[PDB]
Design a protein around this motif. Structure first.
Motif, PDB file in Angstrom:
ATOM      1  N   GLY B   8      16.225  -0.431  64.472  1.00  0.00           N
ATOM      2  CA  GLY B   8      16.399   0.136  63.134  1.00  0.00           C
ATOM      3  C   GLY B   8      17.255  -0.728  62.227  1.00  0.00           C
ATOM      4  N   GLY B   9      17.266  -0.396  60.938  1.00  0.00           N
ATOM      5  CA  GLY B   9      18.072  -1.120  59.957  1.00  0.00           C
ATOM      6  C   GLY B   9      17.279  -1.608  58.761  1.00  0.00           C
ATOM      7  N   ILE B  10      17.975  -1.836  57.648  1.00  0.00           N
ATOM      8  CA  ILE B  10      17.335  -2.250  56.392  1.00  0.00           C
ATOM      9  C   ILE B  10      18.106  -3.325  55.630  1.00  0.00           C
ATOM     10  N   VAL B  11      17.362  -4.188  54.940  1.00  0.00           N
ATOM     11  CA  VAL B  11      17.928  -5.223  54.073  1.00  0.00           C
ATOM     12  C   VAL B  11      17.217  -5.193  52.717  1.00  0.00           C
ATOM     13  N   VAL B  12      17.999  -5.252  51.641  1.00  0.00           N
ATOM     14  CA  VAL B  12      17.462  -5.258  50.280  1.00  0.00           C
ATOM     15  C   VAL B  12      18.117  -6.351  49.426  1.00  0.00           C
ATOM     16  N   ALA B  13      17.298  -7.062  48.653  1.00  0.00           N
ATOM     17  CA  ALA B  13      17.780  -8.103  47.745  1.00  0.00           C
ATOM     18  C   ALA B  13      17.310  -7.863  46.313  1.00  0.00           C
ATOM     19  N   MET B  14      18.150  -8.238  45.351  1.00  0.00           N
ATOM     20  CA  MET B  14      17.857  -8.052  43.928  1.00  0.00           C
ATOM     21  C   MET B  14      18.396  -9.185  43.061  1.00  0.00           C
ATOM     22  N   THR B  15      17.685  -9.474  41.974  1.00  0.00           N
ATOM     23  CA  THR B  15      18.108 -10.484  41.001  1.00  0.00           C
ATOM     24  C   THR B  15      18.748  -9.835  39.777  1.00  0.00           C
ATOM     25  N   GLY B  16      19.626 -10.582  39.114  1.00  0.00           N
ATOM     26  CA  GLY B  16      20.272 -10.130  37.886  1.00  0.00           C
ATOM     27  C   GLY B  16      20.473 -11.265  36.899  1.00  0.00           C
ATOM     28  N   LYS B  17      21.355 -11.045  35.928  1.00  0.00           N
ATOM     29  CA  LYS B  17      21.690 -12.066  34.940  1.00  0.00           C
ATOM     30  C   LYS B  17      22.625 -13.103  35.559  1.00  0.00           C
ATOM     31  N   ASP B  18      22.076 -14.288  35.828  1.00  0.00           N
ATOM     32  CA  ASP B  18      22.800 -15.408  36.453  1.00  0.00           C
ATOM     33  C   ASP B  18      23.454 -15.042  37.793  1.00  0.00           C
ATOM     34  N   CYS B  19      22.873 -14.057  38.478  1.00  0.00           N
ATOM     35  CA  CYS B  19      23.410 -13.558  39.741  1.00  0.00           C
ATOM     36  C   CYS B  19      22.324 -12.950  40.627  1.00  0.00           C
ATOM     37  N   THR B 165      23.149  -0.684  41.132  1.00  0.00           N
ATOM     38  CA  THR B 165      21.711  -0.528  41.347  1.00  0.00           C
ATOM     39  C   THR B 165      21.331  -0.728  42.817  1.00  0.00           C
ATOM     40  N   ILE B 166      21.785  -1.834  43.403  1.00  0.00           N
ATOM     41  CA  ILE B 166      21.450  -2.181  44.790  1.00  0.00           C
ATOM     42  C   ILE B 166      22.095  -1.238  45.816  1.00  0.00           C
ATOM     43  N   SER B 167      23.303  -0.769  45.515  1.00  0.00           N
ATOM     44  CA  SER B 167      24.033   0.136  46.402  1.00  0.00           C
ATOM     45  C   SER B 167      23.378   1.513  46.479  1.00  0.00           C
ATOM     46  N   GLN B 168      22.951   2.029  45.328  1.00  0.00           N
ATOM     47  CA  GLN B 168      22.284   3.329  45.255  1.00  0.00           C
ATOM     48  C   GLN B 168      20.872   3.282  45.835  1.00  0.00           C
ATOM     49  N   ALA B 169      20.221   2.127  45.709  1.00  0.00           N
ATOM     50  CA  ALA B 169      18.891   1.913  46.279  1.00  0.00           C
ATOM     51  C   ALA B 169      18.941   1.852  47.804  1.00  0.00           C
ATOM     52  N   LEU B 170      20.016   1.273  48.337  1.00  0.00           N
ATOM     53  CA  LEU B 170      20.206   1.145  49.781  1.00  0.00           C
ATOM     54  C   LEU B 170      20.628   2.465  50.429  1.00  0.00           C
ATOM     55  N   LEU B 171      21.590   3.150  49.811  1.00  0.00           N
ATOM     56  CA  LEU B 171      22.167   4.382  50.359  1.00  0.00           C
ATOM     57  C   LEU B 171      21.188   5.552  50.431  1.00  0.00           C
ATOM     58  N   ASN B 172      20.447   5.775  49.349  1.00  0.00           N
ATOM     59  CA  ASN B 172      19.501   6.887  49.277  1.00  0.00           C
ATOM     60  C   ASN B 172      18.225   6.651  50.086  1.00  0.00           C
ATOM     61  N   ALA B 173      17.928   5.382  50.357  1.00  0.00           N
ATOM     62  CA  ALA B 173      16.818   5.015  51.231  1.00  0.00           C
ATOM     63  C   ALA B 173      17.210   5.169  52.699  1.00  0.00           C
ATOM     64  N   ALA B 174      18.467   4.850  53.006  1.00  0.00           N
ATOM     65  CA  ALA B 174      19.000   4.951  54.366  1.00  0.00           C
ATOM     66  C   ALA B 174      19.187   6.402  54.809  1.00  0.00           C
ATOM     67  N   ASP B 175      19.461   7.284  53.850  1.00  0.00           N
ATOM     68  CA  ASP B 175      19.642   8.709  54.130  1.00  0.00           C
ATOM     69  C   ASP B 175      18.319   9.427  54.402  1.00  0.00           C
ATOM     70  N   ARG B 176      17.213   8.793  54.019  1.00  0.00           N
ATOM     71  CA  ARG B 176      15.874   9.305  54.307  1.00  0.00           C
ATOM     72  C   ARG B 176      15.244   8.608  55.517  1.00  0.00           C
ATOM     73  N   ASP B 177      16.056   7.830  56.229  1.00  0.00           N
ATOM     74  CA  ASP B 177      15.616   7.126  57.430  1.00  0.00           C
ATOM     75  C   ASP B 177      16.557   7.419  58.594  1.00  0.00           C
TER      76      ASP B 177
END
Ligand SMILES: *[C@@](O)([C@H](Cc1ccccc1)NC(C)=O)[C@@]1(C)CO1
Lengths: 222, 204, 198, 196, 233, 222, 125, 212, 198, 196
Positions: B8-19, B165-177
């Protein structure tokens, strides 16, 4: 060997408000990689201010909705035109589903409406009968995509007050009918983007003390 | 039975403004049994970050393999590895074991040191390059992450806003897994500095 | 499967391993020592497939001792556990894999801190305050999650394992014929001969 | 098995081989696959020998009961009874039956009933394992309203090729001629049809 | 539980401004063998409905018998059998849809895919699909088997949604059907050149066309194609 | 996946969709399915995406080495022969279904290759899950002696048929034109008929919403 | 097969078959029952028309339904055995499902329930 | 799914979690797992959600029908056997259920009956059913005494769920507590595991390995 | 499977039955009484399928008690065992068979002799001086074949079963949580509450 | 698939349909199944498309190496190379290849190679799924030493019937004529052969 079951795709969404309830669902019907219909109604008004949708195997879905609508009809005949309450409808559907326990309806059925206090109610069903009253529920193909989003935006999960160091949660200030439609439309557009079985069109059935209202919106046809 | 669904486990990546941002859960398990709450899935070689999901033995092996290869790269090239080049190194290394693959879902994240361009990439178990400008998701809650990222994400987010954005996307996805959770960690990658933040979440 | 338990306290690593060897219908032995000394300050317990379990353990023992002679130096518990993990990782994709689950219990003389490592047959290493293999964790982890502290003494650690074994002897259907308990600290590896009625 | 029935100017002729096999062994080399169900209504049998015999016996029973009450049945009526048994019991039956009969009004008629249990009215029909090898020959050589002499030659040349290529087919070529004159039995031996 | 023995391929259909058009070829396939060529797979019920069936032919003939019995049953004790109380396309479909679903629920299905085409008494177009599973759906264009994959994309170019229906004339709609039949004869291995076509209109009534052939075929480019890669002659 | 290849009077054109899927879930909404063997020979991939990418780059690498060894422009029949013999050796285990097209000193060429190693030659070809939807359009509108602009329109319409009708295909259309005497023009996102509509709500979180336990700076510099 | 309505209403509102069933009880030997403070006693009389019986084997008037419940009767001896048998089965069925022996009220309710069933079923008296 | 019910001085403590999972997918975090048979009787739910929910509600119908018939309160032994005998009729058909039927009658006192889909019926003091049952047993067995107060017994059942919710991937959501007396059951609130974990960790000192 | 032991001495029949109920991974009960009193002088122990084991036992109990009331008479242990055998024989060829193994321990009041009967799920009845079901006999029979005498007292029979249980507690891998011991003689059926440390 | 090769007075003519199918879908309706391995030696291909293409490419390689050293190979030599690959790799190949070539001394020769890997020299040979339906027609209509006009008609009528009944066969009838004059390509469209 003949397989009695099939997958017609689609996704349905039911959110209960303070004094309202919505039951949405895409109008796309599919088989494998082909589109059967771009507009095929899935959420139905069954009378007594109750809306219903059984998503999964369409033949099982149509049979269950047809059999429930008939159960409402006979409830009027047998009990002197008494209005069937949302909790009474929920228990009735359980027996309709559990009646075929060893040859189940391959559907995820959700009903929406108002309780005997005038508050919004949503009931989600197991293919075999198990049911529970819930705040909001997504069912079907893109259910695993929509549900985590609803926990975050409707129930405010993992959200805290800025500056409290995560000690105070975001208060459960409940949404209006305008705000819920916004979340419904955004859920289905996100579902259309990432799930192949969701698209074409969105139909939302809103239930208030006045009656049942219908709204239609276009979705991506790819 | 499925080697990508044992640990089990999850990884998520996201782009932003110069980051760019990369995040993972901390859970390590054996089917239903929870084993560890400190199993980090994000690794870095210079300024290039790599997140690996799937079978944990392969996660550790590939981390040691890519550390092996980037160190030799740095000695020969006399420079640090680049996100675009490392993406190709992961792809070729995974395809080398085509008929005996590592059961993983690698995710590359980082910023090019020369151009300043934010870069993220995704891979399957056999090494197909998924180069998306928005977000890359991987793991047992990939469906849950896809739904979160498609709704929450908006282009050109600031490092402080992208973190939310990335923290809320990870946490709420992990709580449904069931196989994800037990703590979470987020990296905020910039041209000059990288901020590592451990998140408070459900422990069930 | 056999009972393999490990706990890292303040100054030592304590390992508890079941004494029973069962083949088919009969318990052939009730005093089996399911552990091997890899180096003066590093101990490894093991459980799994009948033949693979000892063969792998003695293979690791031979390699660590070979290193100790060549370099005149004892490898750190971390370096030993990484070596064991790589061997099991190589084995999992071979013609016939080693079906062996191990616990590395060592004391780092350089760091002056005890260390416990958990590696399964696939090659999954994790450093833990307490560890178990197979079904052992299902009965024990809740007791360990409740009582465990990092500043616990060796005496306190033995009392917690006693509580863990008592739960195993009550709820688990298999009779594992008690456990052999060994302490790994700065002075080396010693065996607790009085655990039958401690 | 090689069976066929051909309508012509004066009526209809049914043709068949005489080989029934259990694997590669010929259990019967003188089999009669042309079964009578009514005076001027006959059938060709292919597939399971047990199934086709049981069906033909029930049909003969039904048509005998029909004649006692309503008089001489039509060929379509006989084909319907065959169909009713074949379709309703499709899971338990392996039968390929050609139904052919003579009527004073309808002349000669041929109805083929494949495995599923469907009816197909045709000018001529070929069935059995050996029929596959003569689809090309029969389509190029069949004409409507042929004489008795020509129709016998057509069935004789067709089944000879069916016997030649198919291992399941062989023996003698049996023929049953259905006209206004009556019912005529014809037989052709290997020494004749093999050298055609 | 059964298996299809004698089979019929695609049944394609679409709706235009004044009615519907349905078509199917005259083949009865026996596995890979193209056995029968005189098979009518479009069954007209009354003067306002045509039922197109694909799949098992023996099951099709059973359905054909059921539809003839429905006409006989509807006319019993009914003085308005040819007027107000005549069989609507909606009545014919719903009956079949009930039968199809009941049979699959008994684990003994009719191995078919059926499209019911017709015009209602009020003038409305009717086009609905039902198969061996009992799955029902309506669409501006409907096609079974290979038609769903090949004919549907072509027919949806003419009528993409409900607003395109009143914009499509009989001539344009029929041209799209004839073209779809040509494409199906190109790429479907279980297809026939000979086909039947039925037009149900609210003004001109039922027009049943028999013995239609696929014409204007492009094959000339085949002579220029030789070998499978490197061969020049 | 929908990939096509159309021959015109003075060259060849290939086109593809941009949807990559992991089952019913879309992984990439804008991926490149048009690969390059050599400057003037281009390839369209279908099936296993990792297999199609690697087999193109392997043969493309060998084609480059062959071109430098022979001091000649790469030929389509060379790329074709090397691809088929590689795919045949692995007996279809490498799931690469390709449409290879290009121009060389011998002229214009169009071929299709299957995973087992079989090759086909034609003027119009299609592969993938949306192949039947694409071929339907190709069989209806194709004529001999097409112009450049007519070939682009025909190939793009065939891909669109895959987008709208096939669930395994969607999003954008990528086109690559290869003319006899000119350089090959690769048109990335030639058509974008599937632009996502604006969201009903902005989901930008206020700063301090997520609870943080520990914070530290990561060392990059050695 | 046989379902002829034997027990039916009469013009005056009586079921004669039930009424004449009471007349059979009036013919049967006297049975008395009295309850004290801590005991119940059942007493029955024996016939003297024929006197040469074997008292050991002759079925007694008082029958045990269970270890705690007894049943005496008046009327047809052959009909009583049917009621006694069914009561004994019900006593064991109650112990099997409820995990507790019958109360006297329940056993009485069952026996009277069986008797009532025979007063409005076709083909029975 | 973790469900426990233990017998003590003050009656019966029933504690359950609220998570529902289909494979790796978490279907819900707020699912009721205690069926309120009547104001006096309770039934836990483990295994098939529909099988437990349907038949235990059906049990309430049979218990009500018994009390109307006999004019007396139904015993726990009789109530449990109604479900047990019914389940045994369906043995082999594919039902999946593991339940504890809890009640406090005058005739029996506090009583726990374990009934499962195989047809097993067992009377006992301590029971745990589900995928996280083994984790619940650990905390329960080591801290259980007969002379526990109502306050301490409610906490022990709550703590036993928390331990199982933490370690078992399928267990979690929230904790539902019940205290059964002779006059009836008393509901003791819904306790979210996400909030309960940190509260217990700080106050008790447990869960040291988890960083917070 | 569970431990079901029986021994017939001079004046009584002694039945020993295991207390453990194991379901999957956990021991749910350690005080289970796997026996039912059919009549004042007849006792039956049982083991097998989870649900069938008690359902069959109570079914027989109901039938014997029904006979005892109807005839005001207690059936002989032979007559009871023959009734049990026929019920299992009818069950073996039904839709879903009772997978229950039984031991009939009764004292004949007419004969003044103890009797022990062994019937399996198939319906195989045998009168034995000592009996066991499943794997129980594999460990015990050699001890019973050695020490058993027909003129043994009740006290001697308890000592032999103690030795049989000690062998089961040593060699058998399953923990059956001890045994409940019951005596069937002329005075009826009594339970030995002191066998834990006799 | 419907393939055949017929020897005649002046040489040999090879014939084939143009249909390749993946299940029930026609992946290619203009396929060339007549593959050249040498100037005046050709082959008909049936079975696995990937197998038959790989074999023919290796044979063309072997015969090119043969010609460089020893000159023009015989038809028997080409049939031997085909057989060697088919027989030795029988477990991994599904190929039914008809080998037909022209020689100045040997005239026209036809060698059929079925699945197993055996060689059979025949005056004419039919292969593929569609060949089963024309076994009767070809045996009755084939004559030795026919003219070019007659042989083209024989193959045209045979393959038309093969295409008519077989679903796997279809498209256009391709023909390659091998004589002393050279190599001639012939093609016949559906509008012609269907109405024969
Ligand atoms: C548990 O056993 C679940 C869920 C559940 C919900 C409601 C009532 C009973 C059970 N049951 C199933 C089917 O698995 C958990 C969460 C482990 O799945």
């Amino acid at each position: 060997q003949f397989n009695p079951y099939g997958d017609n795709g689609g996704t349905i969404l039911g959110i209960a408000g303070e004094d309202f309830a919505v039951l949405a669902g895409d109008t796309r019907n599919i088989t494998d990689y082909s589109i059967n219909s771009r507009y095929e109604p899935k959420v139905f008004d069954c009378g007594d201010n109750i809306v219903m949708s059984a998503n999964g195997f369409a033949a099982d879905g149509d049979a269950l909705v047809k059999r429930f609508k008939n159960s409402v009809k006979w409830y009027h005949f047998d009990h002197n035109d008494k209005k069937l309450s949302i909790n009474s409808a929920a228990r009735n559907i359980q027996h309709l589903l559990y009646g075929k326990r060893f040859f189940p309806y391959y559907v995820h059925t959700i009903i929406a409406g108002l309780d005997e206090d005038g508050k919004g109610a949503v009931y989600s069903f197991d293919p075999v009968g198990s049911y529970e009253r819930e705040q909001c529920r997504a069912g079907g193909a893109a259910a695993s995509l929509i549900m985590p989003f609803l926990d975050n935006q409707v129930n405010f999960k993992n959200q805290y007050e800025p500056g409290t160091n995560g000690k105070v949660k975001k208060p459960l200030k409940y949404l209006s009918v305008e705000e819920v439609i916004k979340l419904v439309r955004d859920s289905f557009t996100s579902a259309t983007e990432r799930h192949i079985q969701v698209g074409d069109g969105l139909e939302i059935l809103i239930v208030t003390k006045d009656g049942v209202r219908k709204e239609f919106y276009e979705l991506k046809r790819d | 039975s499925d080697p990508s669904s044992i640990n089990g486990g999850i990884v998520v990546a996201m782009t932003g403004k110069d980051c760019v941002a990369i995040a993972c859960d901390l859970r390590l398990g054996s089917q239903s049994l929870g084993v560890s709450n400190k199993f980090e899935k994000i690794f870095h070689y210079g300024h290039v970050f790599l997140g690996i999901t799937g079978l944990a033995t392969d996660v550790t092996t590939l981390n040691e393999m890519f550390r092996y290869k980037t160190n030799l790269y740095k000695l020969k090239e006399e420079r640090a590895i680049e996100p675009e080049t490392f993406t190709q190194l992961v792809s070729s290394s995974l395809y080398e074991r085509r008929f005996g693959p590592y059961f993983v879902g690698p995710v590359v994240a980082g910023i090019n040191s020369k151009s300043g361009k934010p870069f993220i990439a995704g891979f399957d178990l056999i090494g197909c390059i998924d180069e998306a400008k928005d977000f890359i998701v991987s793991g047992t809650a990939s469906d849950q992450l896809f739904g979160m990222c498609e709704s929450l994400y908006e282009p050109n987010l600031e490092p402080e806003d992208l973190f939310e954005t990335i923290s809320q996307a990870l946490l709420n996805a992990a709580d449904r897994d069931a196989l994800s959770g037990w703590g979470a960690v987020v990296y905020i990658i910039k041209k000059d500095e990288v901020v590592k933040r451990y998140l408070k979440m459900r422990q069930d | 499967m056999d009972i393999i338990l490990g706990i890292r306290v303040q100054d030592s690593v304590i390992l508890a391993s079941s004494k029973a060897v069962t083949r088919g219908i009969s318990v052939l032995k009730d005093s089996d020592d399911k552990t091997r000394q890899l180096s003066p300050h590093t101990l490894m317990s093991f459980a799994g497939e009948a033949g693979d379990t000892v063969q792998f353990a003695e293979y690791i023992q031979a390699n660590i001792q070979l290193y100790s002679i060549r370099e005149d130096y004892e490898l750190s518990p971390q370096a030993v556990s990484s070596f064991v993990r790589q061997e099991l990782a190589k084995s999992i994709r071979s013609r016939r894999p080693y079906q062996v689950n191990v616990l590395i219990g060592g004391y780092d003389k350089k760091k002056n801190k005890p260390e416990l490592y958990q590696i399964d047959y696939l090659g999954t290493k994790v450093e833990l305050p307490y560890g178990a293999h197979g079904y052992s964790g299902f009965y024990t982890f809740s007791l360990l999650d409740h009582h465990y502290r990092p500043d616990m003494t060796t005496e306190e650690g033995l009392d917690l394992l006693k509580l863990c074994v008592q739960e195993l002897e009550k709820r688990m259907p298999m009779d594992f014929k008690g456990v052999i308990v060994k302490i790994v600290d700065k002075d080396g590896i010693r065996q607790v001969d009085d655990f039958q009625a401690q | 098995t090689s069976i066929m029935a051909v309508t012509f100017k004066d009526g209809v002729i049914l043709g068949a081989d005489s080989r029934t096999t259990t694997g590669a062994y010929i259990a019967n080399r003188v089999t009669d696959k042309l079964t009578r169900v009514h005076d001027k209504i006959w059938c060709c049998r292919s597939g399971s020998a047990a199934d086709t015999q049981a069906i033909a016996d029930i049909v003969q029973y039904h048509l005998e009961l029909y004649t006692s009450q309503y008089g001489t049945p039509s060929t379509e009526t006989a084909a319907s009874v065959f169909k009713e048994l074949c379709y309703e019991n499709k899971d338990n039956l392996t039968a390929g039956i050609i139904v052919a009969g003579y009527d004073d009004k309808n002349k000669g008629e041929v109805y083929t009933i494949p495995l599923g249990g469907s009816v197909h009215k045709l000018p001529y029909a070929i069935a059995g394992s050996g029929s596959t090898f003569i689809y090309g020959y029969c389509d190029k050589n069949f004409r409507e309203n042929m004489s008795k002499e020509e129709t016998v030659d057509f069935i004789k040349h067709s089944l000879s090729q069916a016997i030649k290529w198919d291992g399941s087919s062989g023996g003698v070529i049996r023929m049953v001629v259905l006209t206004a004159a009556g019912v005529e039995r014809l037989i052709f031996y290997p020494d004749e049809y093999e050298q055609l | 539980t059964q298996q299809p023995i004698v089979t019929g391929t695609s049944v394609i259909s679409m709706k235009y401004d004044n009615g519907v058009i349905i078509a199917a070829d005259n083949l009865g396939s026996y596995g890979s063998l193209l056995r029968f060529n005189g098979v009518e797979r479009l069954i007209p019920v009354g003067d306002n409905t045509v039922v197109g069936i694909s799949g098992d032919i023996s099951d099709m003939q059973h359905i054909e018998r059921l539809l003839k019995d429905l006409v006989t049953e509807n006319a019993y004790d009914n003085p308005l059998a040819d007027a107000e109380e005549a069989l609507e396309p909606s009545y014919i479909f719903e009956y079949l849809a009930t039968v199809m679903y009941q049979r699959r629920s008994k684990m003994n299905p009719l191995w078919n895919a059926i499209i019911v085409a017709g015009v209602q008494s009020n003038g409305d177009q009717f086009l609905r699909y039902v198969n061996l599973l009992g799955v029902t759906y309506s669409s501006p264009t409907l096609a079974t088997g290979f038609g769903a994959h090949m004919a549907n994309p072509l027919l949806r170019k003419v009528v993409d949604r409900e607003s395109d229906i009143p914009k499509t004339t009989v001539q344009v709609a029929e041209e799209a059907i004839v073209n779809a039949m040509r494409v199906l004869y190109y790429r479907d291995a279980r297809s026939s050149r000979n086909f039947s076509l039925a037009i149900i209109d609210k003004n001109t009534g039922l027009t049943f066309k028999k013995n239609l052939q696929v014409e204007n075929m492009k094959w000339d480019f085949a002579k220029d194609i030789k070998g499978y890669g490197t061969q020049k002659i | 996946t929908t990939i096509v290849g159309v021959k015109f009077n003075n060259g060849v054109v290939i086109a593809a969709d941009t949807r990559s899927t992991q089952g019913p879930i879309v992984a990439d909404k804008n991926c490149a399915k048009l690969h390059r063997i050599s400057p003037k020979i281009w390839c369209a991939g279908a099936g296993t995406a990792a297999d199609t990418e690697a087999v193109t780059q392997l043969i493309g690498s060998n084609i480059e080495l062959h071109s430098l060894y022979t001091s000649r422009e790469p030929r389509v029949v060379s790329a074709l022969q090397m691809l088929k013999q590689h795919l045949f050796k692995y007996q279809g285990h490498i799931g690469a279904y390709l449409i290879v097209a290009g121009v060389d000193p011998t002229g214009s060429h169009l071929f299709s290759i299957h995973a087992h190693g079989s090759t086909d030659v034609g003027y119009y070809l299609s592969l993938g899950s949306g192949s039947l939807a694409a071929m339907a359009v190709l069989e209806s509108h194709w004529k001999q002696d097409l112009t450049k602009e007519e070939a682009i329109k025909l190939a793009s319409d065939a891909i669109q048929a895959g987008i709208w009708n096939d669930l395994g295909s969607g999003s954008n259309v990528d086109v690559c034109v290869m003319e006899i005497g000119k350089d090959a023009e690769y048109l990335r996102n030639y058509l974008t008929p599937n632009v996502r509509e604006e969201k009903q709500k902005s989901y930008k979180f206020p700063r301090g919403t997520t609870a943080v336990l520990k914070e530290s700076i990561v060392n990059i510099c050695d | 097969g046989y379902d002829r309505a034997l027990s039916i209403f009469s013009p005056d509102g009586h079921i004669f078959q039930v009424e004449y069933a009471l007349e059979a009880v009036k013919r049967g030997t006297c049975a008395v029952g009295v309850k004290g403070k801590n005991c119940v006693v059942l007493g029955c009389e024996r016939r003297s028309t024929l006197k040469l019986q074997d008292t050991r084997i002759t079925p007694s008037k008082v029958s045990k339904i269970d270890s705690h419940v007894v049943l005496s009767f008046s009327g047809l001896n052959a009909d009583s055995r049917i009621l006694i048998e069914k009561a004994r089965v019900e006593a064991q069925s109650h112990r099997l499902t409820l995990e507790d022996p019958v109360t006297v009220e329940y056993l009485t309710r069952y026996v009277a329930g069986v008797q009532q069933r025979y007063t409005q079923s076709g083909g029975v008296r | 799914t973790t469900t426990l019910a233990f017998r003590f001085q003050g009656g019966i403590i029933v504690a359950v979690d609220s998570r529902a999972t289909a494979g790796n997918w978490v279907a819900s975090q707020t699912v009721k797992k205690v069926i309120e048979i009547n104001p006096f009787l309770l039934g836990t739910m483990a295994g098939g959600a529909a099988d437990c929910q349907f038949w235990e509600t059906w049990l309430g119908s049979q218990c009500r029908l018994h009390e109307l018939r006999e004019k007396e309160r139904i015993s726990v032994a009789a109530a449990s056997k109604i479900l047990s005998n019914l389940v045994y009729q369906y043995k082999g058909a594919g039902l999946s259920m593991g339940t504890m039927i809890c009640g406090y009658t005058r005739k029996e006192g506090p009583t726990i009956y374990y009934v499962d889909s195989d047809g097993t019926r067992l009377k006992g003091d301590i029971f745990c059913v589900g995928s996280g049952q083994t984790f619940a047993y650990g905390v329960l067995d080591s801290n259980y005494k007969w002379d526990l107060s109502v306050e301490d017994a409610l906490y022990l059942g709550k703590r036993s769920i928390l331990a199982a919710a933490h370690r078992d991937a399928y267990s979690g959501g929230s904790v539902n507590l019940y205290h059964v007396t002779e006059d009836g059951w008393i509901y003791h609130g819904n306790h979210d595991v996400g909030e309960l974990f940190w509260k217990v960790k700080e106050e008790e000192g447990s869960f040291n390995n988890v960083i917070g």
